[PDB]
């Protein structure tokens, strides 16, 4: 699959979401983090 | 022309994104193979990405999608993990850099679970882990996730 199916703007995988045009997402927040070691 | 606005940990906007990150952690079927073993994060920094050009590009597309989807964008806040986060915040999301052999084709993939996007921070299936320690479950190295506005419009369900 190269683009959205006809009449559609995204794919919902089942839950993950897929767009085929970069301009359909804005990277609003950049989160810097570590995964915590469980105690 | 991207500006990063550093949010204070006592700011409600920081706390909102912090809570969405911590609350959406799930157990994974790979048992932490891809993204590591953890129940919570150490939230170090949350920055608002400010780029007028990339925002107008987004809102312009969102309008087109609304008109094709009964005057609703079907906008969602979703996490993205990628080795190319630095490039994405400066030049925007780019479908031309998508791997053709993905589960749902050459697309840009998002999750409502932070721990899901965490699995892709160092590459597909966590790649070879963090650059320094080659460890997918590294507690030392600092990771970066994007919390993004995503226009889904009319979304095609696939298994
Ligand atoms: C080299 O990269 C880039 C360089 C400059 C701008 C954008 C990019 N890259 C992307 O926007 C991009 C995001 C996600 C994926 N893949 C998946 C699995 O979601 C691929 C490319
Ligand atoms: O954020 C992501 N990056 C790369 N691949 C993914 C696959 C499924 C769900 C989310 C992602
Ligand atoms: Zn490391």
Numbering used by the authors:
A (entry chain A): 1115 to 1128, 1137 to 1161
B (entry chain AAA): 952 to 1110
Q: What does the report in the manuscript say about this coordinate set?
A:
TNKSs are ADP-ribosyltransferases that catalyze the transfer of multiple ADP-ribosyl groups from NAD+ to their protein targets. TNKSs are involved in the regulation of many cellular functions such as telomere homeostasis, mitotic spindle formation, Hippo-YAP signaling, and glucose metabolism. TNKS inhibitors are often based on molecules with a dual-binding mode to inhibit the catalytic domain, addressing two subpockets.
To confirm and structurally characterize the simultaneous binding of fragments 3h and 3k to the catalytic domain of TNKS2 through X-ray crystallography, we utilized a cocrystallization plus soaking approach, where TNKS2 was cocrystallized with 3k. The crystal was subsequently placed in a solution containing 3h. The resulting structural model showed the electron densities of both fragments. Although all hydrogen bonds were conserved and recapitulated the overall binding mode in 3k compared with 1, the phenyl-containing linking region of 3k showed poor electron density, possibly because of the flexibility of this linking region. Similarly, the conformation and position of this linking region differed when comparing the structures of the fragments with 1. These results indicate that the linker could be under strain in 1 owing to an unfavorable gauche conformation. A different linker could possibly resolve this strain and result in a higher binding affinity. Inspection of the X-ray structure in which fragments 3h and 3k were simultaneously bound to the catalytic domain of TNKS2 confirmed an unfavorable linker geometry, resulting in attenuation of the main contacts. This cocrystal structure prompted us to investigate this region and seek improved linkers to circumvent the unfavorable linker geometry. Next, the 13 selected molecules, together with 1 were docked into the binding pocket of the TNKS2 structure cocrystallized with 3h and 3k.
